[PDB]
Symmetry: D2
Subunit: 458 residues, 4 copies
Amino acid sequence: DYKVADITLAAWGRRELIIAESEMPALMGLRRKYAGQQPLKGAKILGCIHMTIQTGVLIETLVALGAEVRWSSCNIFSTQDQAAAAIAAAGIPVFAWKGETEEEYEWCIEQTILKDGQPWDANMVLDDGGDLTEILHKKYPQMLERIHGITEETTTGVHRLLDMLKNGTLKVPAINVNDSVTKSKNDNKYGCRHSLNDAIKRGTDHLLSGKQALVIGYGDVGKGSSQSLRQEGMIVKVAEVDPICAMQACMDGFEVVSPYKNGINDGTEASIDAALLGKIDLIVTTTGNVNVCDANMLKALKKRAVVCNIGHFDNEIDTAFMRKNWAWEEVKPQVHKIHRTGKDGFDAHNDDYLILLAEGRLVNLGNATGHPSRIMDGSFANQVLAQIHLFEQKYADLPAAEKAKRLSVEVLPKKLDEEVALEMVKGFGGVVTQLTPKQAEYIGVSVEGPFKPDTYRY
Amino acid sequence: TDYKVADITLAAWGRRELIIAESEMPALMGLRRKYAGQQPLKGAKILGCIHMTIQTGVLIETLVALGAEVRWSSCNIFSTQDQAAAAIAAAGIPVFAWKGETEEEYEWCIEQTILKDGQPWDANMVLDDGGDLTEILHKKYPQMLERIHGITEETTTGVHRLLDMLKNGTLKVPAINVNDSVTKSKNDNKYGCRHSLNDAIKRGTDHLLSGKQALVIGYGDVGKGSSQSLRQEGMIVKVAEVDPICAMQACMDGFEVVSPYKNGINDGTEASIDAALLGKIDLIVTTTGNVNVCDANMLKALKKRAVVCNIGHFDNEIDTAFMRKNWAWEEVKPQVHKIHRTGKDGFDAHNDDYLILLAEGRLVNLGNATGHPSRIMDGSFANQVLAQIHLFEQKYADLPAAEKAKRLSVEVLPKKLDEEVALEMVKGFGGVVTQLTPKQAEYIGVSVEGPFKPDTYRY
Amino acid sequence: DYKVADITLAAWGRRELIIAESEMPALMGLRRKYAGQQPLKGAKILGCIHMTIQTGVLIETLVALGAEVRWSSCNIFSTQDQAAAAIAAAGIPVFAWKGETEEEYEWCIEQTILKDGQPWDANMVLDDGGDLTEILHKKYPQMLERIHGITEETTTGVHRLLDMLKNGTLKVPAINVNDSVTKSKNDNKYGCRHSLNDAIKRGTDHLLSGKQALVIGYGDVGKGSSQSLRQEGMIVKVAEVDPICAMQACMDGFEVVSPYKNGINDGTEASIDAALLGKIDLIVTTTGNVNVCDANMLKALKKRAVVCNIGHFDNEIDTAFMRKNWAWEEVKPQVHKIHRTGKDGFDAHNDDYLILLAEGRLVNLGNATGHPSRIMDGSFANQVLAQIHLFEQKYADLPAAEKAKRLSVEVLPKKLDEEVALEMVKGFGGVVTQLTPKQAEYIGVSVEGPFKPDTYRY
Amino acid sequence: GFTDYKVADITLAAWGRRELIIAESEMPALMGLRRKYAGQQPLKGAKILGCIHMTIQTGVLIETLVALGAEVRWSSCNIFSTQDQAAAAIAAAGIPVFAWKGETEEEYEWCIEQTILKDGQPWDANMVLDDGGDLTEILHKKYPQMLERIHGITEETTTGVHRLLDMLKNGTLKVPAINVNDSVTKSKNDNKYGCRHSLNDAIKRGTDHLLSGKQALVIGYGDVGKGSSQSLRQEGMIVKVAEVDPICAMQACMDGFEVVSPYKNGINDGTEASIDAALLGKIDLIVTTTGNVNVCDANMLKALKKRAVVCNIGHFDNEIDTAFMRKNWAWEEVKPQVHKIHRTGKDGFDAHNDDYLILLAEGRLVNLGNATGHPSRIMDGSFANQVLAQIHLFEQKYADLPAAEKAKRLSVEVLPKKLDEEVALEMVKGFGGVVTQLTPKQAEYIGVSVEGPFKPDTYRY
Ligand SMILES: NC(=O)c1ccc[n+]([C@@H]2O[C@H](COP(=O)([O-])OP(=O)(O)OC[C@H]3O[C@@H](n4cnc5c(N)ncnc54)[C@H](O)[C@@H]3O)[C@@H](O)[C@H]2O)c1
Ligand SMILES: NC(=O)c1ccc[n+]([C@@H]2O[C@H](COP(=O)([O-])OP(=O)(O)OC[C@H]3O[C@@H](n4cnc5c(N)ncnc54)[C@H](O)[C@@H]3O)[C@@H](O)[C@H]2O)c1
Ligand SMILES: NC(=O)c1ccc[n+]([C@@H]2O[C@H](COP(=O)([O-])OP(=O)(O)OC[C@H]3O[C@@H](n4cnc5c(N)ncnc54)[C@H](O)[C@@H]3O)[C@@H](O)[C@H]2O)c1
Ligand SMILES: NC(=O)c1ccc[n+]([C@@H]2O[C@H](COP(=O)([O-])OP(=O)(O)OC[C@H]3O[C@@H](n4cnc5c(N)ncnc54)[C@H](O)[C@@H]3O)[C@@H](O)[C@H]2O)c1
Ligand SMILES: Nc1ncnc2c1ncn2[C@@H]1O[C@H](CO)[C@@H](O)[C@H]1O
Ligand SMILES: [K+]
Ligand SMILES: [K+]
Ligand SMILES: [K+]
């Protein structure tokens, strides 16, 4: 009962799992610590995390505690066929597949909900994009009563869930595991300072030392990425709208500049400050806004400059005017060449042009695999610990006199994160000093924890 | 004028330092200019207890220029600078502080701060850093407490005392957590220690740091600042922590996590200490703020001629009381001591079995140096001033009994004021911020002018 | 005739040659300067450096002045198929492809000398490593009558030239281009620094922030490698045999240790500091010596360790040990898994293996592309200058009386290198101040002549 | 005899002596020579003249010289570079010295003359140890009669080396001299890392200014220039480099710096129109590391941004135009070694001026003026090399040789590399590092004896 295209590729995926499993000591520590206790015995879960080589390890930890899972996908493209087949090669049925059919990933989801005609006894839901949440709440209202908790990991998907609580029909407590410190720090400031320079140097094979680059935004992603260039000898300037992030940039050794004169964006050609644009060799966008690099900027920029993007959306740079006015030429599968001569008819070589690296999209995926396995360790143990927490309280088994008391969406409490951090530190080989009772009394916390309040920003 | 300073001749030098320092702190000068006509502190009375360096003088002077009259003393024994005290006292302003005092003189400073001519001062707010002055007010003189509108706290260890008194209801007047603003926690705790730590070490020991090995205890904000101050000079740094989150961050920043005790278990016996690791470290810095984090049995197993100093706010992190009973002390120079091991009655003048200790385990950046640059103190003194502005308008003591029941709590400053302070800080460096267009602001769900981040944002 | 992997990549190649032409201002300036006179009319060159994009640009510059060239691969895993095909499309026979074999590596050199069944009338020589020079000097010395000079790129070559000069078996003058400042303090120091971590990531996909490494040797290449591994958050230590280099490393912020107790190496298993090797994760050797990593340290290394090497010859690591007692498994090109159990057989579930990069040869070229264009520009400008200088003398057409006075190893003067440095500076947009007559008189040099004396170490 | 000294005072000896006894553990190489050569005393009968800044480390060097059987007299190389405590400590030990702080050039010349003149009569010296060639040039100028008995001279700085080279080129030098600046453990150790260690400390303790987010301009990219540029960056500073040498500019560009010129296109003519006034209007800190003349002209201090900091790290003061300052603008002091320069005029002074200028150490050495110089572990190698050079040259006996052989012994030479390796090896062991030793196979393959030296004479490191 599998839809995976090719099942014979399991051994390749098996050894890829084996090499990938070693670099994720968190899940190994969770498997060792809770072995023999079996805290997930009798649990039935259905979920749709994006299928990759690490996702196959994530399922392996869950089944090690005695759970039964049926699997699907949250998108169309993020699914490695050989790894999914390797999971299918075991006793776990899987349905994720790279069929490239947008009208067919919905029908794949329908098979996990119902085994054969009759619906399945679902206790926990491990959602990624929130579409499973909506399909359960809309098409099968009767199954929701036997659900203990759901788990969501995405951006602005929790935003939809929070508002749906106010509008009613949400009868199950939910966890906002996205706000974990470990996962937040691993996702933004660490996975970037390792992959930005690698993707750039793979795409262009240029030399960075001595050149000048401009960075838009100094948020989490912008700070994590701004230090991948200054450590290479580049001279870096920062652009921002939030004064506090600008102050942090000033105190960190950078310089803050504005593309428009006086920072005012009037829209006329007189607003563009061409003086500073005649010395720039590279522009990066780290913000999540829209049209932060407009059409007027790209005319006044210095020749042969490079262009790239890190934000999730693609409308940071005015690609519509660029496609409407200037012609494109391809250098290699993911590098493009755009001239400013005219609509068509460029020479073999020219002196007036620019360069794009990901046709205005996410550079981390176009040029490279993405984050490594070590960094993505934290984001996958939070899910498991949260399932542990929600499986024991048994919301669905409680009578109606306390449904209103326990019906809310919350975040993961501080204690469970520290366990993951301790396991990760033990992965590196570090050692932690246990507190004597006198010192714990002096600082007024328990020996086991927690060590910090909820108003603390690490 | 209450003349009590070590020397008075040093006023002019402090005056020139004050003139130069004003050009350094632009946000505070701009606040003074903008709030010059409103006089939002008309009739405000303050008590002051903070480090008496040259930066605090401009804050005191703007407080005076905004219609407030105040009294001051030093938070710590080794904090005052004589030129600043002389220059400020030359302006007809009472103050009581100098450098190198004793514990009895230290407490006499507070008892002079809160008393005048045998009668209690008619103070309406209190400014405290350290929490000792609050304890003196609360314990011995409860009769003046109800006349208080609020108190400002400058450091974390004071906030701990405020919270523990709030838990048992001993706190009777509300307080503002000044130490919580983003322009405070991510500026003073981190960047200033980074600028100041190596300066004090060099001014005290003159030792070369490149190629040596050091151990830093704790990885909070002060720990991060210290690690940055040390590694940038070319050292080999190791960090010890009790919070797993901070250990993970230390592993992420490129440092190593080690524990002096075997298996991280403090057994207390002389055997549990991992003497192999301590037989290589040349410098120890304590950042935790806990008590007795530097055990007596670890000090006996260190390398000869090792350096010991403290950056925390208390002197209980190092077992300096154990040394004073068993080992002999000789003074190299002011604030520098050689402690010879294995003996008390005397020391061989050429003996090599000794240690060097700086500032007797107290604050190291203040006792041995000047502390922080004014460019850093500006971002804190602005929040202090604004918090006092907000606090004075409440007039807590004049509310009816019912209102006081729902007004006794702790809280923070709004984000808009902090963003204004940051904006005025940035422009001093010569930078330019870009303003949004209405379409972008409506896209990100934010106004053109106002807060840009939600409350749960960790920055 | 020729043999390359494929030729259809000539369009993409030519696009990359055009884009790389813009990042080498010095070579463009010299090609513009000498195109109108062609000093190399009739000059014939037989070169054997690495065949890459820069090398193709160098060949184009050589043929732009009227020369005739032939080429072959310098290392077994260094050539680029696209660049070789693009140059072969220009009318120059070339023999180089990836995945070559040691016996087949000799095949390339044998036919670059022979033309249509006869040896060719080569006049000048370019080599990188001295492997072709020994073949020339060892089998048939009848070529050296008409050869005007020999040029060497690397330090090992110069060592071999001097070792031959000790015996007096050398018969042709050589001009040293290695010891030029614009080459020694640029190529070794900055190319390896800019490329080593990228080559590591292109093949490991690990997280380098929070690991342990050891780098052996602290030369210019060693300094570059140590600075390269610093910026990735790694923890590194330096082992040296030279007191001065050890002092410099100690002053740079490293820990200096040796894998031997008190430094004494005798061969017994009891002479190895087993504790230190039990926690190291990555090892890189940058020495140029023999038996730098003996057999006994490979037995006492920590599980799951990565082995790296950027030496020209494969004598740093005792590979015969593995080939005679251990078994290898390949996960992907230029990466193998070497188990420490036996050569008979193994299982995938074991954890007693080692990870090796590029089978122990140069990983800068084996696992990556190599140096960028802007770094090779400075080397190729000096190469072209020395190439033009030596031909004008016409050594091979002189009587023995003047032949006696010319057998010598010479270098380029100081003044010529300063022009190349000036051209490289203006590529970044910088401006160099001009000395006034008074200042020039006071210092003791002419207003525009060489400024530093011959003994300056820089 | 010993009584005739002149220092700040006496009482600082007890504390100074503690500083020396602390420093003895910080300099292993010098103590290694002290232990090795004290049993045979190869310096007996030497009468050494000396001129280098008086500090703690130089006091330990003087103690090392006496421990081998020397009779030395010492003085000041720089006007502001003395230390009171070490000067008091050495004086009470029986070795006469003449050095204090905040003197005038008359007193400086008086001390220089008095060091070489004993009881009104020229002193029958056999050795000279100068720094900068001042004392060496005096003898060729006023006392030509001392040079028939003087065995040799030693030189420490680059400017002194250049002066001796010019003297030899003109054919007026009389006595052979050895330059110790060219040794690897001197050129690539003292000039670079010590300037790195001591640059920002002087700024930090002279002005107490934050260095994050500021802009500075470093002129010159020698060894000292490289060290200073590396010292400024590590504090979080955006700094710029200018030069006249293309190769060093290429190195600076590769390092991660921007190369600009303080003139419109690099051509200077003395006209104000040639100044790149836009760039100089936003620069806060200036450092000159050239040793040339007039690298900071009047039109740079007439066009700089207000409230900027000015410094010099080269040997001599003429590198910047102080003479313009002394007669066009007014001066006022805030603290010792710090000043205020006002561009409004030489009168009309008022404390609330907003376009003032700040100058550090009056254009002399700032690492030794506003700070206490390099640490002991760096000066260890330089002093060990100096004492080794003195020991080696004392064994040749140039004065007593016949004039026929004297013609072939007049040159400027450098020490053999084996002594450099000995110094470096004993320096390393003060850190804890362990140096590997070669097996016969590796020694034969490399082609170098197991005992050193392992590198040719053309290596640059
Ligand atoms: N792995 C990845 O590539 C990855 C991961 C998570 C998020 N992201 C994306 O990165 C973007 C931001 O990430 P973040 O966590 O740093 O966000 P953030 O919440 O920290 O905000 C980004 C910053 O951009 C600033 N900004 C907004 N408009 C601007 C403008 N007009 N000019 C200059 N600065 C402006 C904001 O003030 C903020 O400081 C989003 O699009 C997010 O989806 C990427
Ligand atoms: N000198 C200064 O400039 C300065 C400035 C601000 C605060 N302080 C003082 O420093 C102290 C601590 O600084 P903070 O409050 O900013 O830091 P912090 O609140 O972030 O916590 C200090 C760190 O020490 C750790 N720690 C506690 N006990 C430990 C133990 N036994 N072993 C190892 N680690 C342990 C904690 O987990 C925490 O990470 C306070 O008393 C504060 O008042 C000094
Ligand atoms: N990978 C590349 O891109 C590249 C480029 C050029 C040269 N190389 C090769 O690298 C090698 C060395 O490079 P280099 O020119 O910088 O060398 P180098 O001449 O500058 O010296 C190498 C260093 O290794 C040290 N060393 C020698 N034997 C040692 C031992 N047994 N233990 C420890 N240290 C030892 C030496 O003292 C020296 O400091 C040569 O074989 C050269 O051909 C590699
Ligand atoms: N303060 C200290 O502790 C200390 C220590 C050692 C040396 N020094 C002094 O430093 C000085 C020089 O040091 P060094 O030996 O590294 O010098 P250096 O000779 O090695 O380099 C001087 C640099 O100045 C540049 N230069 C010269 N004139 C210039 C001009 N007009 N404009 C721009 N650049 C110009 C040259 O191109 C060169 O790069 C000497 O006078 C020496 O006495 C001071
Ligand atoms: N020189 C100084 N002037 C004023 N406040 C200081 C100084 N040094 C430290 N502080 C502050 O005093 C507190 C010490 O714990 C912190 O808030 C720290 O930022
Ligand atoms: K200060
Ligand atoms: K290439
Ligand atoms: K010193």
